[PDB]
Every structure is written in structure tokens, then in C-alpha cells.
Amino acid sequence: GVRTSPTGEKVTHTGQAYDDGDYRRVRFSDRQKEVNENFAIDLIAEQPVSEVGSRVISCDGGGGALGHPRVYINLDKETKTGTCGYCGLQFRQPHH
């Protein structure tokens, strides 16, 4: 999700962009500013919400021992979704 700045400089996922006044932009002359193209926030926002039939669900990130430590998520709040603190995947209970 790269957007350009008024000076034409690409904006990183962290949000750092040099100001017009700043002299440090000279380091990119005749060269390029390295920016990763895959914003992880937009990618994780694209994942669908899982629906499960229990008050507590477990997430390990997938792949067993190739994921993150296994944690358990409470799903009692009806007007929200439980989010894994490692992976960012969302879970909920079937409503309406």
C-alpha cells in the first residue's frame, strides 16, 4: 500500500518519508530508496474471519511447530472478534 509524498518519495509501511526541507534526500540521488511493496497490515486485513462453535479457540499460526506458540482466545464478546496476538487472524461465534 505505497502512496507517494508531495516530493515524489515513496512512503514506507512504518510511514517514514523525508520532508522537503531535509537534506538527507541527497543520498537517493542517482540511486533509489528501498521500499517493501507488501504492506502486512493490508494483507492481514484481507483475511476472512473464521466462525467456530466454541467460546474458546486455539491458534498456533499453522504448520504446527512451524508457527507461533499456541495460545487460546476467548470469544464471549458478541460485538467484536478475537484476534491472535501473534498471527493477527480473527475468530468469532456465529451471530444473528
Binding site: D60, G64, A65, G67, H68, P69, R70
Partner: protein, 54 residues
């Protein structure tokens, strides 16, 4: 490695499955294990001669 998680790190599956293993992995990779006070001179037969550590 010695089956003592307060010295040797546990396996990755254990660290990702059980609470004690994760705590011990965290502490061994951030602070490290404490060694009791004392002094030793240990020497081996290295290929170039006697190699020692005080």
C-alpha cells in the same frame, strides 16, 4: 544436551507448546543461566598443546 532446561534450551516444539519451556527459553536467551561462584582451571589436550581457561 543435558535434560535440564535451566541450562540447556528446550526444543522448539516444547517452547511453542508448554508454558515452562517458553519461560525457560525466554530467560536463557535474554539473561542466560547463572553459574555458581567459584574459579576453575580446565585444560584439554589441544592439537597445538595444552589449552586452558582460568
Amino acid at each position: 544436551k543435558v535434560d535440564d532446561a535451566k541450562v540447556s534450551p528446550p526444543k522448539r516444539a516444547e517452547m511453542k507448546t508448554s508454558m515452562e519451556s517458553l519461560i525457560h527459553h525466554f530467560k536463557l536467551y535474554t539473561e542466560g543461566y547463572q553459574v555458581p561462584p567459584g574459579a576453575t582451571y580446565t585444560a584439554i589436550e589441544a592439537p597445538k598443546g595444552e589449552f586452558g581457561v582460568y
